[PDB]
């Protein structure tokens, strides 16, 4: 069995990547460049328990970032609702371009190794009006020399060596979700008893022009990974919680870069860009049940012809029949 | 770029090997088990120039067994003839099953990692009619514990463990293999174990056989396939059936013939191969000689079952991003 996902079909990996820059449309009226179609794809991961412990192991060591998985689970941040389907973290290259690799993988099962997503970000930042972005960024910077700092954030987005690439931060995620026209939700390491995490909405587009399922990422130790839904059926539902447990209460995930009126109508705004559902969960006061908001997650839609996970699964079967 | 060839498309490789066992026809009437269709496939290597030497070096390090290439070239056994196309040696695992690995690669661009060819060979020697084979082997051995000696040759072909993962194979194993494939095998080495030479599927009439050879290279107990380079005309697409030897041309050995077969060697060659008579430079520069050569097949492995075309698409993609 291959030691990583991409090794299962290098040829197909390259075909996928070569579709991506041709799916990009660049407007001429100042409108941000964005994907025409591919932003709607979503990967689901197959179930591995149908095998034997030694086999599980090799599958997990190849595909799964078990360190991040375990850290986020042990904080009750990942996979804490009994109602909902398990999410698993996929390994991702830690080269500085990992926000792009994790995002690329969630949708397309390949990493950003041609820098297509990375270049799209630097492009928007370097070669259009970013006034609104800067404004929303200044607001967030003050909730917790403007020109010097803004120039640096743009420079961070380049494909220049400073780790092969400059790491990226919140505003970069925000710009990226607007290039994809698709929300990104980051589940990050962080106990209140003792900033990257949160919800990024494509607010430069009307919600009707956007894909209404999120890309879900994990973040820990300065490293992004996709958190993709495990295939099952069923009866649990595909959703990601929009709040965290905080001891006896709940703390809403941070919604990034909102302007003041937007923040006033935050719940409404969330309900436009995401498919917001209510989920009963056991209370940690005397309560026993509370309803919390969660977003619906997409069902697997990445056609086999562009799905490395399908090919990976099929290698697994072949190698398992031989036991 | 991929470290080896199979890494180019691991999934396609699995599918290729999956097709192999179901292409084997298994007669009850005692006639040897053979391939219905897949023996007619041939791989070629793609042209590795038009690239710059750091990338040409990347490719050759990845795909070419340069040590064995250099060896067979310096001893003047491989690519000695300036009139025919260059052949290249592809890396092959040396686990003891490399006769099969090399042969499997030549036709299918994959190695015999599922032991389909290995098992077919053993299945022939252990579950069918081996009278005539044992006879030809005796005849050949005496040209220089016969039941026991033959008995271990049958065991060597097994998938048992011997210090490699598998027992090594010999001349008689090659001859049986060519009759399962219904296709000649030609081995180039430094004899020309005297493994070098021509192996014809004499348990079949030539009419029921594919008349293009599988070409292997052999040195240091190691087999590799010797495949043609793709776009290299005007040179002749053929392998010579003789070597230069001390000022003369000497026929490659033809293995396991009976006496009456040997009295008509040239006729047998012309039935099982596509023999052509070609001119080459003599030792006196005032002189040309006619020699026999056997036509080599054209690349016919469809893309859907060709690891080499995927490797090349990878290479192409990488070159533009450089
Ligand atoms: Cl010559
Ligand atoms: Cl000579």
Swiss-Prot record, chain B:
Effect annotated for changing residue 193 to A: Strongly reduced 'Lys-48' deubiquitinase activity
Compartments reported by the entry: Cytoplasm
Effect of residue 65 to A: Minor effect on 'Lys-48' deubiquitinase activity. Strongly reduced 'Lys-63' deubiquitinase activity
Domain OTU: 87-229
Active site, per annotation: 95, 98 (nucleophile), 222 (proton acceptor)
Superkingdom as given in the UniProt entry: Eukaryota
Region of interest called TRAF-binding, as start-end residue ranges on this chain: 53-266
Outcome of substituting residue 95 to A: Strongly reduced deubiquitinase activity
Substitution effect: residue 170 to A: Strongly reduced 'Lys-48' deubiquitinase activity
Chain positions covered by the region annotation Interaction with ubiquitin: 168-170
Protein name: A20p50
Lineage start: Eukaryota, Metazoa, Chordata, Craniata, Vertebrata
């Amino acid at each position: 069995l291959p030691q990583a996902l991409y090794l299962s079909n290098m040829r197909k990996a390259v075909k996928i990547r070569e579709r991506t820059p041709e799916d990009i449309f660049k407007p001429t009226n100042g409108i941000i460049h964005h994907f025409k179609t591919m932003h709607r794809y979503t990967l689901e991961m197959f179930r591995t328990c149908q095998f034997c412990p030694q086999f599980r192991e090799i599958i997990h060591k190849a595909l799964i970032d078990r360190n991040i998985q375990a850290t986020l689970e042990s904080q009750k941040k990942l996979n804490w609702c009994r109602e909902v389907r398990k999410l698993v973290a996929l390994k991702t290259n830690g080269d500085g371009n990992c926000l792009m690799h994790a995002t690329s993988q969630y949708m397309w099962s390949v990493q950003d190794t041609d820098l297509v997503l990375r270049k799209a970000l630097f492009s928007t930042l370097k070669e259009t009006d970013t006034r609104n972005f800067k404004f929303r960024w200044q607001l967030e910077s003050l909730k917790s020399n403007w020109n010097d700092e803004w120039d640096n954030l743009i420079k961070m987005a380049s494909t220049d060596t400073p780790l092969q690439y400059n790491s990226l931060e919140e505003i970069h995620i925000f710009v990226l979700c607007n290039i994809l026209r698709r929300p990104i939700i980051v589940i990050s390491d962080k106990l209140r008893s003792l900033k990257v995490g949160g919800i990024y909405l494509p607010l430069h587009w009307p919600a009707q022009e956007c894909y209404r399922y999120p890309i879900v990422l994990g973040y820990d130790s300065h490293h992004f990974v996709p958190l993709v839904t495990l295939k099952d059926s069923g009866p649990e539902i595909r959703a990601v919680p929009l709040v965290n447990r905080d001891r006896g209460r709940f703390e809403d995930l941070k919604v990034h870069f909102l302007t003041d009126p937007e923040n006033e109508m935050k719940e409404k705004l969330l309900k436009e860009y995401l498919m917001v559902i209510e989920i009963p969960v056991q209370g940690w006061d005397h309560g026993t049940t509370h309803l919390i908001n969660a977003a619906k997650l997409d069902e697997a839609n990445l056609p086999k012809e562009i799905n490395l996970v399908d090919d990976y699964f099929e290698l697994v079967q072949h190698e398992y029949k031989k036991w």
